Coordinates of C-alpha atoms and ligand atoms in Angstrom, one line a residue:
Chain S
X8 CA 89.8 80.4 156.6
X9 CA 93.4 80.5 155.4
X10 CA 94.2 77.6 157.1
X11 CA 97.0 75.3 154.6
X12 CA 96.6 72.3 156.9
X13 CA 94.5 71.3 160.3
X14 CA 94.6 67.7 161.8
X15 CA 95.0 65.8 165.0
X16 CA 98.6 64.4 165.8
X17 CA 99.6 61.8 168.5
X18 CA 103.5 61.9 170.1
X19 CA 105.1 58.7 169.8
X20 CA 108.9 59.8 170.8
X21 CA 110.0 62.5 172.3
X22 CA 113.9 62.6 172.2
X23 CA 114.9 59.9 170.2
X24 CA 118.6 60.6 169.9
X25 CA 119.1 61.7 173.8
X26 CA 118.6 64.8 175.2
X27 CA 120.6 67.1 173.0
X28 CA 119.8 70.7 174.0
X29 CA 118.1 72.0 177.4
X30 CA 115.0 74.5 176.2
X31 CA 114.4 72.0 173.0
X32 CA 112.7 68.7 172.2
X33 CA 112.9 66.9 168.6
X34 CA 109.2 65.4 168.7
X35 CA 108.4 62.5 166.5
X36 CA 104.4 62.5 165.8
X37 CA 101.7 60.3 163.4
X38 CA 98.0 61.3 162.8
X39 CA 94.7 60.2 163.0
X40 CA 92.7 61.3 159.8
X41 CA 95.4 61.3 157.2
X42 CA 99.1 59.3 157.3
X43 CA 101.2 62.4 158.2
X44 CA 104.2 61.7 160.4
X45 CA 105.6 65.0 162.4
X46 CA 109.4 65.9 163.3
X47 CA 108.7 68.9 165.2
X48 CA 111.0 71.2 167.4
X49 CA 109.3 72.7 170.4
X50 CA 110.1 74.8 173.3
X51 CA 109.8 72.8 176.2
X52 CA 110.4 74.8 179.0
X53 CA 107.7 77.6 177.5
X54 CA 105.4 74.5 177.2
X55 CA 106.0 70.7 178.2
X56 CA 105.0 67.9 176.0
X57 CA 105.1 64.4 177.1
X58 CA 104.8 61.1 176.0
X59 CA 101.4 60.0 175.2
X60 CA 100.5 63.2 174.9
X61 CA 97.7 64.1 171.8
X62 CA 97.4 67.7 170.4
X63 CA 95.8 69.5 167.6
X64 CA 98.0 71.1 164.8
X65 CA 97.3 73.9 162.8
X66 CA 99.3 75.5 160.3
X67 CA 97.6 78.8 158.2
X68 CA 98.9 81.8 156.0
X69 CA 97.8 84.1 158.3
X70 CA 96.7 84.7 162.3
X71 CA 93.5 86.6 160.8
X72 CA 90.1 84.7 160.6
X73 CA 88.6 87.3 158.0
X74 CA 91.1 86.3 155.5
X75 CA 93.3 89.3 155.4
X76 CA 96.5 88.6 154.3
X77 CA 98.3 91.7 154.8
X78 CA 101.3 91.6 157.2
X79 CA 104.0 93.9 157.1
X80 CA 105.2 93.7 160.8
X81 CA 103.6 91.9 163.9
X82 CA 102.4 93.8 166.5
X83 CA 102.5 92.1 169.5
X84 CA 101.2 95.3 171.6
X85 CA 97.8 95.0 169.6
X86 CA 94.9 93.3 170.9
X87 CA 92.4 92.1 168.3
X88 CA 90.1 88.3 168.1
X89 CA 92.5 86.4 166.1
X90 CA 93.5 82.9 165.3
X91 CA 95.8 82.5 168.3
X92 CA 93.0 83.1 171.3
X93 CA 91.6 79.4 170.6
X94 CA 95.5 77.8 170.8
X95 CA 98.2 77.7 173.6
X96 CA 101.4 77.6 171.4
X97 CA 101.5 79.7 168.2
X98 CA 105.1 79.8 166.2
X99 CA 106.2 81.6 162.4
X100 CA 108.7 80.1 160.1
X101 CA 109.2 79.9 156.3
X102 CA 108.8 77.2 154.2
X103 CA 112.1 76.7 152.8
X104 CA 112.5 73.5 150.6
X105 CA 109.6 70.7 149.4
X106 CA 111.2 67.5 148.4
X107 CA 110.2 64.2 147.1
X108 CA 110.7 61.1 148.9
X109 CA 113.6 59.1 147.2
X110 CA 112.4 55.5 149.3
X111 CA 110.7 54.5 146.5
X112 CA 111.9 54.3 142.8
X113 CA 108.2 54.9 141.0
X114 CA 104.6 56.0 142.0
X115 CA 104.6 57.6 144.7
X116 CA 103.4 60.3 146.6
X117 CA 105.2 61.2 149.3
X118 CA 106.2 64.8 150.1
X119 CA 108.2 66.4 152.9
X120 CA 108.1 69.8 153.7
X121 CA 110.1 71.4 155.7
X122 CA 109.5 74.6 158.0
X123 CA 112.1 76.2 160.0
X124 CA 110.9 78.2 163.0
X125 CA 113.8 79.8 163.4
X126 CA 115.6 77.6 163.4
X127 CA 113.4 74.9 165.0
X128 CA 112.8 72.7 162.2
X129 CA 109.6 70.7 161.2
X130 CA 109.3 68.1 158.5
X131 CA 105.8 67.9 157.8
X132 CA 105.6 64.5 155.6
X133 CA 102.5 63.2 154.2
X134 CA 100.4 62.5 151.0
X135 CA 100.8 65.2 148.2
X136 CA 97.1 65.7 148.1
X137 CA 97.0 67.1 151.9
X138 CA 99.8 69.6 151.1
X139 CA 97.7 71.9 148.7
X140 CA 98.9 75.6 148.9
X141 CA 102.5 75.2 150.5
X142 CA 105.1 77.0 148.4
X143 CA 108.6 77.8 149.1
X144 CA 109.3 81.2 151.1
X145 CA 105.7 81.5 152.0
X146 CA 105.5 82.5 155.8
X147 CA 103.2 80.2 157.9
X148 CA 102.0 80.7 161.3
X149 CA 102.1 76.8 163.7
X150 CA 99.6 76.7 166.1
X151 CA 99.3 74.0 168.5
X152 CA 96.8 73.1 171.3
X153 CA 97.0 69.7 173.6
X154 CA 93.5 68.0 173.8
X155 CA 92.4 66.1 176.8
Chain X
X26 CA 166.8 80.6 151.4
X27 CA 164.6 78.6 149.6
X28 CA 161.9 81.2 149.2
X29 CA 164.5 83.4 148.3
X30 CA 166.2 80.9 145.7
X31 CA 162.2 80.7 144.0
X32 CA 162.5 84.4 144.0
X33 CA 164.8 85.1 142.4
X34 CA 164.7 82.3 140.0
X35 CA 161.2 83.2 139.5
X36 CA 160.2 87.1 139.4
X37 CA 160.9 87.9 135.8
X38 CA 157.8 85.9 134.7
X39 CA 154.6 88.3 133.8
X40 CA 151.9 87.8 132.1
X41 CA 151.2 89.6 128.7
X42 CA 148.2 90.8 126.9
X43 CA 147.8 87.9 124.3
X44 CA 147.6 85.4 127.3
X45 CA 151.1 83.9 127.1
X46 CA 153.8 83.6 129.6
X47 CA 157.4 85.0 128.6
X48 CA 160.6 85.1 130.6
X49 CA 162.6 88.5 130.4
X50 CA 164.3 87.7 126.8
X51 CA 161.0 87.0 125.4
X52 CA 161.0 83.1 125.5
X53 CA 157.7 81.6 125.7
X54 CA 157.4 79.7 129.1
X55 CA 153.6 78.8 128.7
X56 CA 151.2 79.3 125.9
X57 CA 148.5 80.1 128.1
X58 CA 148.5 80.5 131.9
X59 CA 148.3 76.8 133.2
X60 CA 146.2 75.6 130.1
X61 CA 143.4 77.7 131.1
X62 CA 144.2 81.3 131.5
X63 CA 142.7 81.3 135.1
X64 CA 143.4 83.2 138.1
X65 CA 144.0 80.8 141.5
X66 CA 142.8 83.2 143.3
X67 CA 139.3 83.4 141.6
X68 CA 139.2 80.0 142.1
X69 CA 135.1 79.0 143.6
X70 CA 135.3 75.4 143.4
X71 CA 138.0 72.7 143.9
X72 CA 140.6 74.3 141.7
X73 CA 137.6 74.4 138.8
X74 CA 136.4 78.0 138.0
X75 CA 132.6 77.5 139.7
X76 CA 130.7 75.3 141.0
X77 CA 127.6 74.5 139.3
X78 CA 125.2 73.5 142.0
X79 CA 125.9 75.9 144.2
X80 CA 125.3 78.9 141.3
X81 CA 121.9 77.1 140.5
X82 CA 120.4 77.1 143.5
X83 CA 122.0 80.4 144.5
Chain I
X54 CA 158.4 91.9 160.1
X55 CA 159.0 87.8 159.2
X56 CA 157.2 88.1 156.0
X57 CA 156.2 84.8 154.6
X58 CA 153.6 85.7 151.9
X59 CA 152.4 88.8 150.2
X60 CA 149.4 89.3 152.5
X61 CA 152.5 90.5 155.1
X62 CA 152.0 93.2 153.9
X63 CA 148.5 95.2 153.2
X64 CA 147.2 98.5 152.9
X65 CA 144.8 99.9 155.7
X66 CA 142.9 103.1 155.8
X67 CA 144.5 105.0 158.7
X68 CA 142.6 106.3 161.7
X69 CA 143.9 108.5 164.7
X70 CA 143.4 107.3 168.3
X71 CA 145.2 108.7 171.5
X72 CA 147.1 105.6 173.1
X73 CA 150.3 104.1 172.0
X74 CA 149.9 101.1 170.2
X75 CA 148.5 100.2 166.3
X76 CA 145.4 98.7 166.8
X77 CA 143.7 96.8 164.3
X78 CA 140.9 94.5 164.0
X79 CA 141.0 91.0 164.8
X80 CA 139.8 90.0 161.6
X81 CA 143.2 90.9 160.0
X82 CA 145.5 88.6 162.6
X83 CA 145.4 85.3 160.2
X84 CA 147.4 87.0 157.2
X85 CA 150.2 88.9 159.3
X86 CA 150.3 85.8 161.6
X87 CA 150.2 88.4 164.6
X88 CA 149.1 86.7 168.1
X89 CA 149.1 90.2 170.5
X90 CA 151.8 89.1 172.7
X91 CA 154.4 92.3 172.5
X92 CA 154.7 92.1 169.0
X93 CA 155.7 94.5 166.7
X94 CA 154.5 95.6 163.1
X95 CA 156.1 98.3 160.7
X96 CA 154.3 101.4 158.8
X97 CA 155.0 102.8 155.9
X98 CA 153.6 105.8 154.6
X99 CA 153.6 106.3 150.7
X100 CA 154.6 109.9 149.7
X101 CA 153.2 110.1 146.4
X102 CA 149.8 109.8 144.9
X103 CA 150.6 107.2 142.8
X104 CA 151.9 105.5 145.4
X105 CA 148.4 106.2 147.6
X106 CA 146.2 104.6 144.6
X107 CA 148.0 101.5 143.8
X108 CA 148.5 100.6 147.4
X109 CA 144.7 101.5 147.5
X110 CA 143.3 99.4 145.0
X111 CA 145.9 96.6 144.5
Chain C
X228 CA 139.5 95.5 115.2
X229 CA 141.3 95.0 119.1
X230 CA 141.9 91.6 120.5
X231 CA 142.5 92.2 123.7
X232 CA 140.2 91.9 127.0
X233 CA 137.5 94.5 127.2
X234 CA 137.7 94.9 131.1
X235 CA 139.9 96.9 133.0
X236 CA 142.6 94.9 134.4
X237 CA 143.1 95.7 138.4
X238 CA 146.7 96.9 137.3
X239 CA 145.2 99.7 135.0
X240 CA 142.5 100.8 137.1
X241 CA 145.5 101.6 140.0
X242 CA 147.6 103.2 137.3
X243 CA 144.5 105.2 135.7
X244 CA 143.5 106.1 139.4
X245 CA 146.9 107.2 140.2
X246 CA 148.1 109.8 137.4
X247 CA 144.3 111.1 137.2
X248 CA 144.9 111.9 141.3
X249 CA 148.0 112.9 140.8
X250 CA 147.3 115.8 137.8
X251 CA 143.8 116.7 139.7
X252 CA 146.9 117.4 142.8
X253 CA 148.5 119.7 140.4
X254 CA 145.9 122.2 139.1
X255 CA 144.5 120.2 136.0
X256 CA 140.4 121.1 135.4
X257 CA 138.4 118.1 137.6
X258 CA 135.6 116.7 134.7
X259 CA 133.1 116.5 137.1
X260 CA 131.4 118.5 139.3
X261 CA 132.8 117.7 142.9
X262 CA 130.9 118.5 146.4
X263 CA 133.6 119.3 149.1
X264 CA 135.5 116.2 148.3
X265 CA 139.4 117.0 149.2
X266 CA 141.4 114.2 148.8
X267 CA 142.5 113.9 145.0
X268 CA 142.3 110.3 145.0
X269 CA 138.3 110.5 146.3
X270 CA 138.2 112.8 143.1
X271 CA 139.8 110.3 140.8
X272 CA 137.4 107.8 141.5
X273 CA 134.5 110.0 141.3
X274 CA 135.8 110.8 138.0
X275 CA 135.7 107.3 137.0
X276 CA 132.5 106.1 138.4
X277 CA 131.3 108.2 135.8
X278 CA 133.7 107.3 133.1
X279 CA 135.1 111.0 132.3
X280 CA 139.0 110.3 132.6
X281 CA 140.8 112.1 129.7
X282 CA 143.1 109.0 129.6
X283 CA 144.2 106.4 126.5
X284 CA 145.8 103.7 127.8
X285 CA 148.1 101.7 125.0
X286 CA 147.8 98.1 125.4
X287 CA 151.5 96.6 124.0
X288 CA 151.5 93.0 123.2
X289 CA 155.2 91.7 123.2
X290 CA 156.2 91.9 119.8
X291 CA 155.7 95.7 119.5
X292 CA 152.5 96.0 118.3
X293 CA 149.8 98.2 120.1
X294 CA 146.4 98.9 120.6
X295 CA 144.7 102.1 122.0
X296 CA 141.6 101.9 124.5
X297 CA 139.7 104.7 125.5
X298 CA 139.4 104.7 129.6
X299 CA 135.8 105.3 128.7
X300 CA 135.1 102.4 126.8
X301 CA 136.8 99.9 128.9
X302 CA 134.2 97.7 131.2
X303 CA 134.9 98.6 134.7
X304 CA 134.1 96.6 138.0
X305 CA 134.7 95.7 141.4
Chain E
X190 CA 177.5 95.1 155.0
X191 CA 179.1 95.6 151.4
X192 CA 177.3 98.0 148.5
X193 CA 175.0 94.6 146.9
X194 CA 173.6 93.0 149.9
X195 CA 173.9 96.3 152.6
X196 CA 172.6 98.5 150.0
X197 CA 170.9 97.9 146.4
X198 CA 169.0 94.9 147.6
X199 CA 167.1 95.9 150.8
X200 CA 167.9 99.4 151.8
X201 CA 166.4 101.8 155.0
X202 CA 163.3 104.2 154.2
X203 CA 162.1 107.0 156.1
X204 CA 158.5 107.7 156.7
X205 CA 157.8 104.4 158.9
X206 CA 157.2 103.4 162.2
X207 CA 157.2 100.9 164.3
X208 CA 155.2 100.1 168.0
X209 CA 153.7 97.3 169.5
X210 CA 150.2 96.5 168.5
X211 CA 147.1 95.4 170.4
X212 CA 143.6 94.4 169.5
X213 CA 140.7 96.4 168.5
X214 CA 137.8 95.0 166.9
X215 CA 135.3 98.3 167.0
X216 CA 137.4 99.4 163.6
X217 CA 136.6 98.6 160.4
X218 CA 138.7 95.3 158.9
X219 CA 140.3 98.0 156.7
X220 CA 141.0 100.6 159.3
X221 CA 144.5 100.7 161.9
X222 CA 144.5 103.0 164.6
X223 CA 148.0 105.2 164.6
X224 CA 148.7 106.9 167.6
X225 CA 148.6 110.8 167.9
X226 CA 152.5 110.6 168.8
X227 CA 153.3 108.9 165.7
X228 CA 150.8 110.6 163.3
X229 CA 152.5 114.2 164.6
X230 CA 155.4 112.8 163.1
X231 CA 154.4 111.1 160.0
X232 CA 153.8 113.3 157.2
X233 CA 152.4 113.3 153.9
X234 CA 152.9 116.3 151.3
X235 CA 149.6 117.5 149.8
X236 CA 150.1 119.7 147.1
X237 CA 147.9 122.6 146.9
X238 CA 145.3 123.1 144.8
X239 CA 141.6 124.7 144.1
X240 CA 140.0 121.7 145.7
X241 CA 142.0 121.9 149.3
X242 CA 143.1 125.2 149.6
X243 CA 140.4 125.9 152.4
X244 CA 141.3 122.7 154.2
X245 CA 145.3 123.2 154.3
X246 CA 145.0 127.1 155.7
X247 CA 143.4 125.6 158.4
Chain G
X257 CA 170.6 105.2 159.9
X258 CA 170.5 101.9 161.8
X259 CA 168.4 101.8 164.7
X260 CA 165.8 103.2 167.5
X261 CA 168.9 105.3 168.9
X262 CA 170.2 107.5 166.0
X263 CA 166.2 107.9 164.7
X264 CA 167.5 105.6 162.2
X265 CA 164.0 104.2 160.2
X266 CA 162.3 100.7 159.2
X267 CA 164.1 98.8 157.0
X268 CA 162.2 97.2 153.6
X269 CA 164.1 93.7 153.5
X270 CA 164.7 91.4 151.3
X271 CA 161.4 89.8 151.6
X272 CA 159.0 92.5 151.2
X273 CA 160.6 93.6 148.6
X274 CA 159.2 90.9 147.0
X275 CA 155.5 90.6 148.5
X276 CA 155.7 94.3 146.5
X277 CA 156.7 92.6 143.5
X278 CA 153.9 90.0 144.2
X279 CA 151.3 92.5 143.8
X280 CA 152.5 94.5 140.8
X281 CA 152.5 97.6 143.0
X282 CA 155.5 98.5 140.1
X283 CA 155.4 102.3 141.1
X284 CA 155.0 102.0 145.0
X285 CA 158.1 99.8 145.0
X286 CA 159.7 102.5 143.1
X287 CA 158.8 105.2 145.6
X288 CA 160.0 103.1 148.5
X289 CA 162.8 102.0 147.2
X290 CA 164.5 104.8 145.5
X291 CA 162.1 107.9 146.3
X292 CA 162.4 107.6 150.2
X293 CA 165.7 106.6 150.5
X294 CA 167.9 108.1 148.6
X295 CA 166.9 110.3 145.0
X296 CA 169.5 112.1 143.1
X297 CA 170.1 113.2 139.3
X298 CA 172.7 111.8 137.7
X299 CA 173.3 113.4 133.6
X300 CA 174.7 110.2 131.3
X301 CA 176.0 110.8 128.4
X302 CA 174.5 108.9 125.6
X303 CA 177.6 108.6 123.3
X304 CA 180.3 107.3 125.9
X305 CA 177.9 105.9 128.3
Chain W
X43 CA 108.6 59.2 139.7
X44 CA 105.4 61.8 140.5
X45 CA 103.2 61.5 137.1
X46 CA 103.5 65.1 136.7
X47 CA 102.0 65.7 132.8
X48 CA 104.3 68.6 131.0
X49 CA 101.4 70.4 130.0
X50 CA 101.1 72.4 133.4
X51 CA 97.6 70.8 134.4
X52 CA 97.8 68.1 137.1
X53 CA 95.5 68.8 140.3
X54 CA 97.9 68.9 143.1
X55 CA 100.2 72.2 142.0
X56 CA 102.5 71.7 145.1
X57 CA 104.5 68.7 142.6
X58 CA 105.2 71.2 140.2
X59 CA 107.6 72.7 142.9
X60 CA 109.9 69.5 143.5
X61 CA 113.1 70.4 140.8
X62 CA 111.2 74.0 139.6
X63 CA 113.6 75.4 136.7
X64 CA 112.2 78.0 134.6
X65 CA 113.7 80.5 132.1
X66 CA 113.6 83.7 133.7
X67 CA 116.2 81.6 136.4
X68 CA 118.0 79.8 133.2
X69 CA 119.0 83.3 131.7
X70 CA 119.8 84.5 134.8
X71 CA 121.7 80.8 135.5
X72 CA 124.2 81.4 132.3
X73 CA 125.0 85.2 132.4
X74 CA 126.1 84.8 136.4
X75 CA 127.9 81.8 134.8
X76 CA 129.7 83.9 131.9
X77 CA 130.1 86.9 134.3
X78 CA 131.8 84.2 136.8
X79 CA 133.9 83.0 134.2
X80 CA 135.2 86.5 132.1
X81 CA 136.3 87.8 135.3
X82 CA 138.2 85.0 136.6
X83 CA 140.4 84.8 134.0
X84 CA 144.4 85.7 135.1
X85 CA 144.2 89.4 134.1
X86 CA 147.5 90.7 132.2
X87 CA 150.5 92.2 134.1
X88 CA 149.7 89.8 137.4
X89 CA 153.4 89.2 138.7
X90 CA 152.6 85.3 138.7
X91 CA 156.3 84.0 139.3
X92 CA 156.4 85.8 142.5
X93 CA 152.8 84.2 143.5
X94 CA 154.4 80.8 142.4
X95 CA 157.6 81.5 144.5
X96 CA 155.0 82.7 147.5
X97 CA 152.7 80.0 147.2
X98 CA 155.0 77.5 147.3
X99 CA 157.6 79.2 149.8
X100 CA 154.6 79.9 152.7
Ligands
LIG196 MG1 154.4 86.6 168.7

């Protein structure tokens, strides 16, 4: 299991500055377990989210469940069991800049990370002690399933 | 006419090897080229050689 | 022809190509201030290698 | 000792460029081994990617004095 | 039209040319496309020696 | 000569005669100027000038 | 503003990437920094009455 981080969201706005662009949606989620709140660019037209909607995110280092972290090109002509049979919506971005929250002016522990799909940003924002292994330029694989 | 005024006025002026500015006699016009010695067109920042911030996270 | 600043005038890397007019990229249209509408630009062909290496490199 | 800048100005590198292409266009002996190149200019610049022009330039400063600098220990670039 | 201004200041050159020029971006930014009727006339000497001699017979 | 009808040739102005001197291009501004134009020998005497 | 201990030794590693500086980048920092700086400098010869008279004349 190379899995960074694995929890259950909740949508609580979908466009919050007005429809913008046709294909994409800025999503603005909370979730259950842990405080995290979730800016999230999707592709609605590939796969509609809507309001009250409630779906599991996953984010890992790799698409493998053995653990192997070789990748030097995706194949998407290759069929194997991987990560991405048990999801419905599976991006790749890079992390690409982890910053401290300024809001407060001493202890705390607030992180943002941000991961561009490309080009679909993500600010992932949550406690520091849920964002163990996230560097800058590591690659991570989204997956994303809605629950019932 | 203008331009060509400036040009005239203004084309003698070269820039020697110990960093001063003379006119065509050999008067000194500037000590060093605009109190720094730098090129304008090297210029990075706002008419500052770099720009610090930008190199760093570069 | 009008030529307001020293970028009026550059040195290109001559190709030949069968029709009738100098064609050159796009890219180059904000220093001549060309626009494509029946205008007109000069050549000039230096004759001497000195000439070739310091329109070349300068 | 010399007080002057260590790189090649952009105004010595067209002047070294242009006498070294214009003796290799009269029949002086190319320093390096050239492969088919034509163009004496091409061979100039081969010549000094790899710092082989047989060229001092003399540096003067205004009030007469010089200094000499060896093409080959002047600090090239872009 | 005197000896100064007609004359010494700006005077005519040969080897140049002059046509109306149109875009093309598949060139290279430092790259102009002459025409064949213009590069037919247009001529550069090349002085003969061990490194071109094969290239000029031909 | 003048123009297109006597094959007459471009004419290096006033003006980029000094976008030449602008880039220090000292010996291609020589070459146009007197090399291309018009070249000729002259012998000067050195004692009565 | 974290409570991140200089040692190197606080649990969750992801704070030591917040302003991450170390001295293979510093050395790197200061000779892009020096190499920025020798070759902006207004190089000797450079015809800088003319780029006055252009700058200002355009
Ligand atoms: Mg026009």
């Amino acid at each position: 299991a190379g899995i960074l981080f694995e929890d259950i969201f909740d949508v609580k706005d979908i466009d919050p500055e007005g429809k913008k662009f046709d294909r994409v949606s800025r999503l603005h989620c909370e979730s259950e377990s842990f405080k995290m709140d979730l800016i999230l660019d999707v592709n609605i037209q590939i796969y509609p989210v809507d309001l009250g909607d409630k779906f599991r995110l996953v984010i890992a280092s790799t698409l493998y469940e053995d653990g192997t972290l070789d990748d030097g090109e995706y194949n998407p002509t290759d069929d194997r069991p991987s990560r991405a049979d048990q999801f419905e919506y599976v991006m790749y971005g890079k992390v690409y800049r982890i910053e401290g929250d300024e809001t407060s002016t001493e202890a705390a522990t607030r992180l943002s990370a941000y991961v561009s799909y490309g080009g679909l940003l993500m600010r992932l924002q949550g406690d520091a002690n849920n964002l163990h292994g996230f560097e800058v330029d590591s690659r991570v694989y989204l997956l994303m399933k809605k629950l019932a | 006419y203008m331009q060509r005024r400036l040009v005239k006025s203004l084309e003698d002026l070269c820039s020697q090897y110990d960093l001063t500015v003379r006119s065509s006699t050999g008067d000194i016009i500037q000590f060093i080229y605009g109190g720094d010695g730098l090129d304008p067109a090297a210029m990075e920042g706002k008419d500052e050689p770099l720009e610090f911030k930008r190199v760093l996270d570069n | 022809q009008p030529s307001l600043h020293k970028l009026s005038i550059m040195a290109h890397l001559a190709r030949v190509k069968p029709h009738r007019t100098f064609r050159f990229n796009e890219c180059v249209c904000t220093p001549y201030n060309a626009d494509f509408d029946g205008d007109e630009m000069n050549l000039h062909l230096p004759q001497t290698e000195e000439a070739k290496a310091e329109a070349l490199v300068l | 000792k010399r007080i002057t800048t260590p790189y090649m100005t952009k105004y010595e590198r067209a002047r070294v460029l242009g006498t070294r292409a214009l003796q290799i266009a009269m029949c002086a002996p190319v320093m390096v081994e050239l492969e088919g190149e034509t163009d004496p200019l091409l061979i100039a610049m081969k010549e000094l990617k790899a710092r082989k022009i047989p060229i001092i330039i003399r540096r003067y400063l205004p009030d007469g004095s010089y200094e000499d600098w060896g093409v080959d220990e002047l600090i090239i670039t872009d | 039209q005197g000896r100064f201004r007609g004359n010494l200041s700006g005077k005519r050159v040969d080897f140049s040319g002059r046509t109306v020029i149109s875009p093309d971006p598949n060139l290279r930014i430092d790259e102009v496309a002459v025409p064949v009727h213009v590069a037919k006339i247009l001529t550069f000497p090349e002085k003969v020696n061990k490194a071109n001699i094969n290239f000029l017979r031909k | 000569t003048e123009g297109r009808s006597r094959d007459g040739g471009l004419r290096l102005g006033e003006m980029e005669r000094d976008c030449l001197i602008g880039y220090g291009a000292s010996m291609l501004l020589l070459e146009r100027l007197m090399i291309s134009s018009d070249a000729f020998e002259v012998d000067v005497c050195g004692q009565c000038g | 503003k974290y409570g991140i201990n200089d040692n190197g030794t606080t649990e969750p590693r992801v704070l030591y990437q917040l302003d991450r500086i170390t001295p293979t980048q510093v050395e790197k920092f200061l000779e892009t920094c020096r190499d920025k700086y020798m070759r902006a400098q207004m190089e000797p010869g450079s015809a800088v009455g003319a780029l006055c008279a252009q700058s200002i004349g355009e």
